[PDB]
Amino acid sequence: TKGILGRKIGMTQVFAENGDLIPVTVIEAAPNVVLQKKTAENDGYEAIQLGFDDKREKLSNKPEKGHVAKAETAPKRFVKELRGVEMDAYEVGQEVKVEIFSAGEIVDVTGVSKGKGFQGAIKRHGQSRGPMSHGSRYHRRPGSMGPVDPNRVFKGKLLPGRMGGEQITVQNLEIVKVDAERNLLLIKGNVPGAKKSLITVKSAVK
Amino acid sequence: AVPFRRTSKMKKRLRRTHFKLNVPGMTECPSCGEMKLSHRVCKACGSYNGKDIN
């Protein structure tokens, strides 16, 4: 398989030479560098781990600097790895850029979600709330615990808690335009995560 | 909404094991002599970042 890692800059709409209107997700991705080529006979499996954008020497520490000095680049802030790629396709230290994708290709997209915080059950899992009138003192409560005979509540009754911050994958997205000059991506749809955040883009396994 | 049993001594201490309060952060004043917080102006010397404040 094939895939890159970038930073989500924004999202807008773009016309596609037919009259219909196509909202798009805008992702800038400076050319990534493979730092380590994970191989089967020592790592138990094959993979490539690669870094996305630079860091200043102030925030760079000595261990990661020594790790990067094999591929002889600037230190990388954002490092992830992919599985299922062609093992001999990528030499260590080479770039991947943006042009390995072409417009019209179905795409698996994965990113962290927008963090929201401690929300109630109403927001968290969207089950309805009680009456707002006719004497109801049950305005926004999260429902009954469960039966009596098991003498305890079961695991996984869905309760108020924190939202967000947990990575989510949208499948079968379609890349509508690639701008290799500015190192930009432009995918139809809506991509999860806050602005200027992590976003990784993969070829769809479907 | 009622304690069904009394809480024993070791349970009480075990709850209170985190209720201890931390020390502040001191730093030696720019003007000599005494102790001061970080990012607070000096109470005694009346100075901060080497500069004097009335």
């Binding site: 709409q13 009259g19 219909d20 209107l21 | -």
Partner: protein, 122 residues
């Protein structure tokens, strides 16, 4: 979004004036009707002389709503009121002459007959 029990204005010569959606068809529980789909309904008030009287269950399609209708180009169509036309099951209207502007969505929903008898199509 035409919804269950919404009162509708009629825009043809079938004699019905105000109809009352029984509920919408399609899936098992359809909470909504947008432009184009058949809704079963009863008639609340009517002209004296008409093919349909007051108070019988009939089948109809809404032809113009006040909530917007979205076309693929990016345009939207919307109106000031809600109207529908009574359709018998031959998928063509009961009245012989309809009034007012009608949306284009009833083209690709196969409705050339009412589209032709429409006085104006936007």
């Amino acid at each position: 979004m035409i919804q269950q029990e919404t009162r509708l204005k009629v825009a043809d010569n079938s004699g019905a004036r105000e109809v009352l959606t029984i509920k919408v068809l399609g899936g098992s529980g359809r909470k909504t009707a947008n432009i184009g789909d058949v809704i079963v309904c009863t008639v609340k008030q009517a002209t004296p002389g008409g093919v349909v009287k007051k108070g019988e269950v009939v089948k109809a399609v809404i032809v113009r709503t006040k909530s917007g209708a979205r076309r693929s180009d990016g345009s939207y169509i919307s109106f000031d009121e809600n109207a529908c036309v009574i359709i018998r099951d031959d998928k063509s209207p009961r009245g012989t002459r309809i009034f007012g502007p009608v949306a284009r969505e009833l083209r690709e929903n196969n409705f050339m007959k009412i589209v032709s008898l429409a006085p104006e199509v936007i």
